[PDB]
Design a protein around this ligand. Structure first.
Ligand code: CL
Lengths: 280, 280
């Protein structure tokens, strides 16, 4: 009734201009065709940076999830409200967007005020949506927090992620949402499960941990072709989550299921080859 | 000036309803992206049966080849003229379509009158197009004749293929096309090269043999992943051709080149996996 079936998914669409050979396009189509993307109520996207592939993606899933938001921190247009340190003069956007099966009553973007090197030359932040499903109001916040970056002063990734999450949980309190409506928060939060920092994220976001299902890492270089190419001998991390603010209505038993769907490789175009014909 | 750069290609898109795990969709995208499909004047498609992937395909290539025909035998609409034993009560269409860089001044479909089992519960036949390039008229007939079928009475494959081709070469005589304009005929003709039947096809289609380049088979179980899956220990055939009616202008030196391009195919959606969230 009021509990949704969300999907978050960092989709690793880097600016096709600086990073040209990653089929950002080809993969946005692949996503549209996947099973996992079907039959949900709201989807949160992350690292959806590239304007083109951004569109390609949001477009594909427009049929089923008609109600969408801009991509966080791209422009001030199309948003009901724009708060925090939004900059026009920065390199990339927040790469966060929310699509939805049911009507979006309100959409608001928020650019984090704090930001560590390389990642702060962008409008990383969070997107808030009030959605109306079956007469009741529900709330979804998508975000993609500070990434672990080499540039960053040792320990800054965490100190800043903390500021950034406090920015979120603060936005929720001040938003005055009635205690009997659910508020979801989720996306690539860049904090590995079962670490010191995880305990902090729970407090800073003001959420409770949830129940997990399926795969036990979301960034897994070992079982995951693209992760593997980038960091061959790297340790898998569980970075993507969907929580619910603890001070508002809790869904019946909230689960996060990591889904490991992979596109079927086609190694040839057809069982036949093509004929070219010309006059030499 | 009047001679074209064609591509025919049987694309093995069976009805996604009876044959669902063949990425007919995923493959129609892959084709749009290939190299071989670029920089031609006319492309002929075959076994383009499924309505959905049919569209996906015809859509991808619309940019470069705007002028298209419907898929042979699907419906009577969109066709300037509809001759032969077209039926409405058959299972599948002819799966033949022609797209083109230059305008299509006339498009006509023809359903073969003869048909051998399994393959005859369908509107297999040929598509004719008059196309206008640089002021001159040129003519392209795509077709996909009777397939070698187990059901078929021993020897009927061939006897019907022959009727069907005579139906084409007859359509060409009675079409009153000017001897000084070229008439191309091509597609999976289901006739292996260097066999007895091959000599017949040349007479029945009223064409001359051409010069060959590149790979020497078009259906090759051994180098082609899909062929291999279906007929592991099967012998490679040359089945796809593009000839020109011998009683009309001949191109300067016609060549069929079998193109052995192979899609480099991505394996994961992102470096991250998707999170599904729900309340169980
Ligand atoms: Cl910007």
């Amino acid at each position: 009734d009021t509990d949704l079936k969300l999907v978050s998914h960092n989709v690793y669409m880097l600016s096709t201009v600086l990073y040209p050979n990653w089929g950002q396009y080809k993969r946005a189509d692949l996503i549209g065709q996947s099973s996992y993307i079907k039959n949900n109520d709201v989807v949160i996207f992350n690292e959806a940076f590239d304007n083109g592939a951004s569109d390609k993606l949001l477009s594909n899933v427009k049929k089923e999830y008609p109600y969408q938001t801009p991509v966080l921190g791209r422009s001030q247009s199309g948003w009901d409200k724009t708060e925090g340190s939004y900059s026009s003069t920065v390199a990339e956007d927040g790469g966060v967007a929310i699509v939805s099966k049911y009507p979006i009553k309100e959409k608001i973007q928020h650019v984090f005020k704090s930001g560590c090197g390389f990642d702060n030359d962008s409008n990383k932040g969070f997107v808030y949506t009030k959605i109306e499903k079956n007469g009741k109001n529900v709330h979804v916040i998508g975000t993609h927090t500070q990434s672990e970056d080499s540039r960053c002063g040792a320990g800054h990734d965490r100190k800043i992620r903390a500021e950034q999450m406090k920015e979120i949980s603060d936005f929720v309190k001040k938003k005055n949402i009635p205690k009997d409506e659910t508020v979801y928060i989720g996306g690539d939060l860049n904090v590995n499960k079962g670490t010191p920092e995880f305990k902090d994220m729970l407090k800073n976001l003001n959420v409770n941990d949830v129940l997990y299902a399926g795969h036990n890492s979301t960034w897994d270089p070992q079982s995951n072709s693209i992760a593997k190419y980038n960091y061959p001998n790297g340790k898998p991390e569980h970075l993507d989550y969907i929580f619910t603010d603890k001070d508002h209505k809790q869904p019946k038993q909230l689960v996060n299921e990591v889904v490991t769907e992979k596109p079927k490789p086609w190694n040839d175009f057809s069982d036949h080859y093509p004929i070219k014909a010309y006059s030499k």
